[PDB]
Symmetry: C2
Subunit: 100 residues, 2 copies
């Protein structure tokens, strides 16, 4: 089961903010990149369930690699991205470029 | 308490159970974990930024709200031994099995 971590994306006055539910991963293990106007998050989650699988009486948490990409408007400035994580939410801030 | 249904894996080891609950974006201390008459519950309420200035969101995929996960654990689960500790959004609940 491909892990597709859920993301909300918001456009604020000076930023886009992407919030990504990435439970079970240290924020430092999530690869955030943005190239060509497309914000990418990529990483891998191990799950306790792939060890002693037969001991689990229920398994549904998704894990494994994920890689999601989000085209953002041209206003998004790839070079200013910051990301901080807490309680497995990675919150990525993408500043907007000043208007042309 | 069940606007969303957090993913939980449950494992029964030789001498303990472990539940792993993906509860991204909630402090572990806001998450109530108890057993009552065999039933392990995990409940609490996740808030989400997407409820604030919702119209500024171009995507909202993250589920939140109250949850109340219940599992009818075997009688061997020592209701008095539960610990629950979260890291990066994953709550790990450990319950030793009864001697008898």
């Amino acid at each position: 089961a491909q892990w597709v971590p859920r993301v909300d994306i918001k456009e604020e006055v000076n930023h886009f903010v992407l919030y990504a539910d990435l439970p079970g991963i240290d924020p430092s293990q999530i690869e955030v990149q943005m190239d060509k106007g497309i914000l990418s998050i990529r990483g891998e989650r191990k799950s306790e369930s792939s060890t002693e699988t037969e001991r689990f009486s229920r398994i549904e948490r998704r894990y494994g690699s994920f890689h999601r990409r989000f085209a953002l408007p041209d206003s998004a400035d790839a070079d200013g991205i910051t990301a901080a994580g807490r309680n497995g939410v990675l919150e990525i801030r993408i500043p907007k470029r000043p208007a042309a």
